[PDB]
């Protein structure tokens, strides 16, 4: 377990996923030095649930999962547990008993583009809300109205995914934010990931 934990492959990844298709990376058998992350002022959000962020190094967990995606600035508050909204209901859901960290930072100099970056997507329509940690990447036509769609796009017959449209001069609330959600395992089995 002498090798450090490769958090660089998560926070400094070249590409980040759309929130509707969030990427999950397995983290195990490593030294998880959480002190350098909490110290860095380049993070806009570092919330912990069930644990203390300053006591993160003194802990051992059964396993560590890292979920990454890109959302809008004013949507970071929806990643927290117990929340509602288009992201918390249709894209990424944390359970009420969530145990882990929510880390996010501003990526306007990476994910914006003159004339708008429209490549990042979120799910705008869904029949029902998401189960915690459920991932829905289907693209079936959504019947918003009463007329059947038969898989044909039209009025009230909509593709479920919508583009974000990140402009370099948007307000901070509309700027892109990369988010890494560290989920800590609560299992009673032997530990796998430990801090120094």
């Amino acid at each position, epitope marked *: 377990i002498t090798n450090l934990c490769p958090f660089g492959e998560v926070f400094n990844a070249t590409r980040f996923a759309s929130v509707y298709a969030w990427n999950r990376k397995r983290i195990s058998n490593c030294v998880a030095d959480y002190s350098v992350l909490y110290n860095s002022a380049s993070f806009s959000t570092f919330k912990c649930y069930g644990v203390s962020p300053t006591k993160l190094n003194d802990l051992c967990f059964t396993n560590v999962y890292a979920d990454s995606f890109v959302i809008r600035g004013d949507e970071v508050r929806q990643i927290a547990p117990g929340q509602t909204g288009k992201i918390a209901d249709y894209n990424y859901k944390l359970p009420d008993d969530f145990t882990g960290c929510v880390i996010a930072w501003n990526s306007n100099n990476l994910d914006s583009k003159v004339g708008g970056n429209y*490549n990042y997507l979120y799910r*705008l329509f869904r029949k029902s809300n998401l189960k915690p940690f459920e991932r829905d990447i289907s693209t079936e036509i959504y019947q918003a109205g009463s007329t059947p769609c038969n898989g044909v796009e039209g*009025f009230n017959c909509y*593709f479920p995914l919508q583009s974000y449209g990140f402009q370099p001069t948007n307000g901070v609330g509309y700027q892109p934010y990369r988010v890494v959600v560290l989920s800590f395992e609560l299992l009673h089995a032997p530990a796998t990931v430990c801090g120094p």
Partner: antibody, heavy 128, light 111 residues
Framework: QITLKESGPTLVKPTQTLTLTCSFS??????????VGWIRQPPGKALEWLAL???????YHTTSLKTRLTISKDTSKNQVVLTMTNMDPVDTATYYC????????????????????WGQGTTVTVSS | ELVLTQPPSVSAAPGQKVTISCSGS????????VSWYQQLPGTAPKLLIY???KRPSGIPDRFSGSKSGTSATLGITGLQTGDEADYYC???????????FGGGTELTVLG
């Protein structure tokens, strides 16, 4: 029913800025897929699409006029505001707003219903 | 210039059928839904057709729409004198990232 009403000056001096407000009733700009558009029509000429503001605050503009057009919304007041800078006599037209009941974008693909409900229209004359 | 082309005028007798055409590129009509509008003299436009061929509530069977390739057509049967108006096609243009209106067609009912 839907009802939109435009308001603003009816006579502006050349090079001044025109500010138009669209007040609407019967729908909400908080609804997914709904936008408010602007159109103008010079005397005896065709309709000219101007701009659109989106429920998610996306903004689109006619390309030849983008550097002159600003659009914004206030969902709580049911109002959209369009400003056009550097007004010329050729900008003398009747200006409309209208509801876009369906406008969505997925990367390169669009759904754009059109304009199902138009306002009365206000006539702006630019003259020195 | 205009990216949608309409004939400037079209005429027929009462009770007859008239068609108004609208041609564009694949950037607009070819890949996006076409809507048609009627504008009586002195008033605001009024939506006649949406999604190429659907009518909103209050529009009679006399108006129909079609789209093939990069062209759309508005058909009006059983012409009445009250149908004299300018008619426009509209759609979204993916290249301009904006909406476009055709030049408009003035319908004359020969009575």
């Amino acid at each position: 029913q839907i009802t939109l009403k435009e308001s603003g000056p009816t006579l502006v001096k050349p090079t001044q800025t025109l500010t138009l407000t669209c007040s609407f009733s019967g729908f909400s700009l908080s609804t997914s897929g709904v936008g408010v558009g602007w159109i103008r029509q010079p005397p005896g000429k065709a309709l000219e699409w101007l701009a659109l503001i989106d429920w998610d605050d996306n903004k689109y503009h006619t390309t030849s006029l983008k550097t002159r057009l600003t659009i914004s919304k206030d969902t709580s007041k049911n109002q959209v505001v369009l400003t056009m800078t550097n007004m010329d006599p050729v900008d003398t037209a009747t200006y409309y707003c209208a509801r876009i009941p369906g406008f969505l974008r997925y990367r390169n693909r669009y759904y754009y219903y059109g304009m199902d409900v138009w306002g009365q229209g206000t006539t702006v004359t630019v003259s020195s | 210039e205009l990216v949608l082309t309409q004939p400037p005028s079209v005429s027929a007798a009462p009770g007859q059928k008239v068609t108004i055409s609208c041609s564009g590129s694949s950037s607009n009509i070819g890949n996006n839904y076409v809507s048609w509008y009627q504008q009586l003299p002195g008033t605001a436009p009024k939506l006649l057709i949406y999604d190429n061929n659907k009518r909103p509530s209050g529009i009679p069977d006399r108006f129909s729409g079609s789209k093939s390739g990069t062209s759309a057509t508005l058909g009006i049967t059983g012409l009445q004198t009250g149908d004299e108006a300018d008619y426009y096609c509209g759609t979204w243009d993916s290249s301009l990232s904006a909406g476009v209106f055709g030049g408009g067609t003035e319908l004359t009912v020969l009575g």
